[PDB]
């Protein structure tokens, strides 16, 4: 009976260890051999890479991740009216520091002038809730004028 | 020591249950809370807040 | 405070300042209202 | 006969607080609170981010905002009614107990 | 023996419950704290968000997802010839309602005129199988003419 108890405990603990080993193999495949979009799977933050290290009866992953550091407030707007046309950002968000409007990335404050390259138009300015009035620069205009 | 190891197994199970609850729910560092205004762009969260 | 020795039903205990054993309700974390508008 | 039940460490109120914190973070900051500090963003713009994330341009969200809000509210109401009508809904938890 | 049977059953059921709890923790991390690209992991459809709710001995996820609703038939084409050059869509699919050709998104019918901004050229028109003849509008031409 003592031997049977030991063997049953060993079987249950071996099943648990096998689950842990399958998780470790998945983390090796996804965190180390690639970059993972799954949240909190390869560490807290936006995953950049991972490095494996061996250990007695286990593995240790060093997860290198990207964490935003210093946030600042800005006044935002879903879209922008220039000539009765609503302009939406191609990749970024419209922000304002109080007087002027820029379009920036969503994870790093890098303001840029709002031009027709950063934005695309869709419809008139009677549907979007919270739209604002600002000028959208046209790169071709000075070249044509020159 | 059959009784002692039965007791040990049950204690381990109980601690594991507490750990399960902690892992599932305690994923947030700070206890956030919504502002007193409840206009989230027309969406109505009053039944889950 | 953070839970040190879990007693149960939200009550934990620790050894803190003479020094003695204190029982308390565990702390989930610092509250933080997000400035949403 | 010596068979007793120990109470869980986290009371139901603490679990409710945890879920409330997760919900408030999700509503007021999107997914940003899961990476670092919670960064506030208007909910319509967050939903436009999600629409971009599923491959739909955000002008679809901005031009159908009221319709999407109404659909979400109706779905939440139907969840309410389904929970309040059918008693045999939480089968798994009751099976565990 | 009765006690040993009870404890063994409890150990097996606790392993099952721990597997379920790990799954729930993963769903909390990915569905709630982020947006998941994994199919049918956070509900049926294209995942938008998720909301957690507590329950006795468990959790309940309200998965908000996006489901296409009203589909319409269109005549499609892999590419388009304008001047002996094959034009492919940057982000979208070429569709036709019977007489005219447009380029649209792949998940929401929003037809647009086929211009050089929506498309990119690659090679001649002798390799693509199923290519069609249509005009690709050049935005700079009227500006130059004006
Ligand atoms: C918001 O940003 C704009 C653009 O950087 C600022 O405008 C410039 O401000 C500097 C002063 O630091 C001047 O030297 C430039 O001539 C300004 N440029 C233009 C085009 O006006 C603006 O001052 C910022 N507003 C605030 C409140 O900081
Ligand atoms: C953005 O600019 C447009 C036009 O420059 C404004 O539209 C005008 O609104 C006033 C007041 O409602 C009307 O009397 C005019 O007839 C409108 N003009 C046009 C061309 O539509 C619009 O109000 C501005 N937006 C904001 C928020 O001030
Ligand atoms: C969000 O939904 C709740 C319930 O679906 C709404 O609360 C109802 O409001 C109406 C009118 O004020 C009352 O007649 C009902 O009795 C309320 N029901 C409950 C359960 O409170 C709430 O009004 C909705 N939010 C908004 C902004 O309309
Ligand atoms: C396919 O779509 C095109 C573009 O919308 C249609 O062409 C327009 O049709 C309307 C009639 O509803 C006319 O008023 C416009 O003048 C047409 N525009 C052009 C540039 O010709 C076309 O009719 C559609 N074909 C079918 C079979 O529905
Ligand atoms: C698309 O247009 C091109 C040219 O406008 C067509 O190519 C012609 O095909 C005929 C018949 O095979 C030849 O006699 C001509 O010499 C070709 N011209 C050129 C410039 O290559 C092509 O056939 C058209 N595609 C379809 C499906 O009709
Ligand atoms: C943004 O403004 C609010 C206004 O109270 C403030 O509480 C918050 O700290 C500001 N955000 C940052 C990053 O300073
Ligand atoms: C497309 O045409 C086929 C032709 O039989 C038809 O069966 C199908 O229902 C059509 N699709 C839609 C969305 O109507």
Query: Phi first, then psi: what are they for E59, rounded to 5°?
Result: -130, 155
> How far apart (Å, rounded) are the C-alpha atoms in residues A113 and A137?
8
A133 lines ligand 2 (CB under 6 A): yes
Spatial neighbors of A61 by CB under 8 A, at least 6 apart, are A27, A28, A31, A32, A42, A43, A50, A51, A52, A53
Per-residue DSSP letter, A56:
T
The single-letter DSSP state of residue A143 is H
d(CA E99, CA E35): 39
Structure solved via: cryo-EM
Taking the C-alpha atoms of residue A61 and residue A66, their distance in angstroms, rounded to an integer, is 16
Q: What is the 3-state secondary structure (H, E, C) of E16-63?
A: HHHHHHHHHHHHHHHHHCCCCCCCCCCCCCEEEEEEEEEECCEEEEEE
CA distance A51 to A55: 13
Q: Are C10 and D17 within 8 A, CB to CB?
A: no
Pairing of strands A132-133, A80-81: parallel
Do residues A66 and A45 make contact, with C-beta atoms less than 8 angstroms apart? yes
Contact between B33 and C33 using a beta-carbon 8 Å cutoff: yes
Minimum-distance CB partner of E37 among A5, A9, A37: A37
Q: How many Å from the N-terminal Cα to the C-terminal Cα in chain C?
A: 32
> Strand pairing partners for C12?
C6, C24
| Residue E100, token pair as written in the block | 């005219």
Question: Ligand 3: which residue has its CA nearest to atom 5?
Answer: D77
Pairing of strands A86-89, A80-81: antiparallel
DSSP-H helix ranges across D33-96: 43-53, 58-63, 65-85, 91-96
Q: Does E66 touch chain D (CB under 8 A)?
A: yes
Residues D51, D49: Cα–Cα separation, whole Å: 5
Breaks (C-N over 2.5 A) in chain B follow: none
Do the Cβ atoms of A46 and A65 come closer than 8 Å? yes
The resolution of the experimental structure, rounded to one decimal in Å, is 2.7
Phi-psi region of C9 (alpha: psi -120 to 50; beta: other; left: phi over 0): left
Can you say whether the dihedral through the CA atoms of D5, D9, D15, D17 is positive or negative? positive
Q: How far is the CA of D69 from the centre of ligand 2 (A)?
A: 27
Cα separation, A55 vs A62, whole angstroms: 13
How far is residue E9 from each of residues A15, B10, D4, E12, E140, measured CA to CA in Å?
A: 15, 11, 17, 5, 76
């Amino acid at each position: 009976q003592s031997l049977q108890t030991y063997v049953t405990q060993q079987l249950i603990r071996a099943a648990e260890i096998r689950a842990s080993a399958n998780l470790a193999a998945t983390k090796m495949s996804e965190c180390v051999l690639g970059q993972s979009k799954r949240v909190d799977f390869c560490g807290k933050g936006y995953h950049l890479m991972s490095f494996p290290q061996s250990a007695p009866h286990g593995v240790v992953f060093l997860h290198v991740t990207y964490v935003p550091a210093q946030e600042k407030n800005f006044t935002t707007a879903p879209a922008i009216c220039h000539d009765g046309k609503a302009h939406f950002p191609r990749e970024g968000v419209f922000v304002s520091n109080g007087t002027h409007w820029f379009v920036t990335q969503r994870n790093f404050y890098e303001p840029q002038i709002i031009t027709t390259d950063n934005t695309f138009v869709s419809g008139n300015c009677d549907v979007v809730i919270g739209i604002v009035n600002n000028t959208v620069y046209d790169p071709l205009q000075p070249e044509l004028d020159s | 020591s059959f009784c002692t190891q039965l007791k040990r197994a049950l204690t381990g199970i109980a601690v594991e249950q507490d750990k399960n609850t902690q892992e599932v729910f305690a994923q947030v560092k700070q206890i956030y809370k919504t502002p007193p205004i409840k206009y989230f762009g027309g969406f109505n969260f009053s039944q889950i807040l | 405070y953070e839970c040190d020795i879990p007693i149960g039903a939200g009550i934990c205990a620790s050894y803190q300042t003479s020094q003695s054993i204190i029982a308390y309700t565990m702390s989930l974390g610092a509250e933080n209202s997000v400035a949403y508008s | 006969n010596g068979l007793t039940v120990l109470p869980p460490l986290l009371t139901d109120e603490m679990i409710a607080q945890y879920t409330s914190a997760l919900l408030a973070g999700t509503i007021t900051s999107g997914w940003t609170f899961g990476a670092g500090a919670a960064l506030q963003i208007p909910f319509a713009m967050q939903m436009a981010y999600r629409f971009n994330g599923i491959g739909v341009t955000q002008n679809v969200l901005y031009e159908n905002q009221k319709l999407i809000a109404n659909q979400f509210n109706s779905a939440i109401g139907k969840i309410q009614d389904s929970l309040s009508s059918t008693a045999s809904a939480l089968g798994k938890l009751q099976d565990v107990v």
